[PDB]
């Protein structure tokens, strides 16, 4: 009764499995329910069983990467709160506009929206905290470092987020329903991620910075290595560009 892709199809497939395997077959025979509609149902019901393991592995990796970037537990915790709150607000808003039939959702737009929201939230939190800590390592006090962080990064965050929200709204003009259904929810989720990153992020930084040494930097010698990389780039840009293009040709071929 369904239509491959919809939920009525899985309704029907599981109902047929019930009807079939409800009564025992004669001895020496086995009965199966195949087809490219039971495969789709089993795939969509095992995908969300593997994604519950992925949801734990990705966070176990996020925490390690955060501890490696900031050699500190409190900074990693603060950034993780930023990211988790952005992701929660995004999921809540999109699920609200989909539950009240305001926008048209899908069980593919959701799995892509989680990824895009985590990416954008982590990026913006790293940008904000890194600019703040760089201004802090140059000597500026907490207030001056906060204002330097904002004036340097906020417009970048806004422009990049609005560009992503426009690019993943122009998917609404595609013809395949896979991509077509990504347009509105991904754009709305990007808008929510940007609003969160541009108001809640700076607010969390402005609150936590005025206690002890919470967001104070530790890895400032990495700036020196990256300055040496920039020196090598500005001194011998031609050879470095040749090497980079040669490396890119490996993949492009």
């Amino acid at each position: 009764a369904g239509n491959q892709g919809e939920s009525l199809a899985n309704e029907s497939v599981e109902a047929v499995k019930t009807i079939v395997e409800r009564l025992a077959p004669p001895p020496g025979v086995k009965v199966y329910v195949t087809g490219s509609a039971a495969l789709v149902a089993d795939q969509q019901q095992a995908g969300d069983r593997s994604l519950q393991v992925i949801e734990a592995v990705t966070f176990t990796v996020i925490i390690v990467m955060l501890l490696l970037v900031y050699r500190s537990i409190i900074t990693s915790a603060i950034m993780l709160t930023m990211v988790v709150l952005g992701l929660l607000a995004t999921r809540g808003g999109v699920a609200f506009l989909g539950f009240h039939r305001i926008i048209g959702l899908s069980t593919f737009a959701t799995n892509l929206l989680v990824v895009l929201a985590i990416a954008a939230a982590t990026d913006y939190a790293i940008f904000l905290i890194g600019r703040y800590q760089e201004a802090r390592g140059l000597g500026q006090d907490r207030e001056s470092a906060y204002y330097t962080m904002f004036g340097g990064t906020a417009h970048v965050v806004l422009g990049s987020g609005l560009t992503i929200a426009g690019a993943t709204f122009c998917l609404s003009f595609t013809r395949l329903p896979y991509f077509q259904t990504l347009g509105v929810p991904l754009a709305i989720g990007m808008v929510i991620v940007v609003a969160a990153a541009l108001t809640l992020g700076p607010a969390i930084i402005a609150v936590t910075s005025r206690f002890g040494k919470l967001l104070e930097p530790k890895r400032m010698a990495r700036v020196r290595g990256w300055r040496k990389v920039g020196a090598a780039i500005v001194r011998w840009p031609g050879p470095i560009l040749v090497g980079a293009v040669a490396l890119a040709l490996v993949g492009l071929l």
Binding site: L85, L88, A89, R91, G92, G93, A95, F96, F99, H100, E143, Y146, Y147, F150, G151, A154, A196, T199, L200, P202, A203, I204, A206, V207
Partner: protein, 33 residues
């Protein structure tokens, strides 16, 4: 006041912003599936 208006306001009202985002997330996550 020699500071821009947007970050100055985000810094003055830092805790109401945090709490407002908190109740927004709470409502949006408990009143719908």
């Amino acid at each position: 006041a020699a500071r821009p208006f947007i970050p100055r306001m985000i810094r003055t009202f830092a805790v109401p912003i945090i709490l407002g985002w908190l109740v927004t997330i709470a409502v949006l996550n408990v009143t719908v599936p």
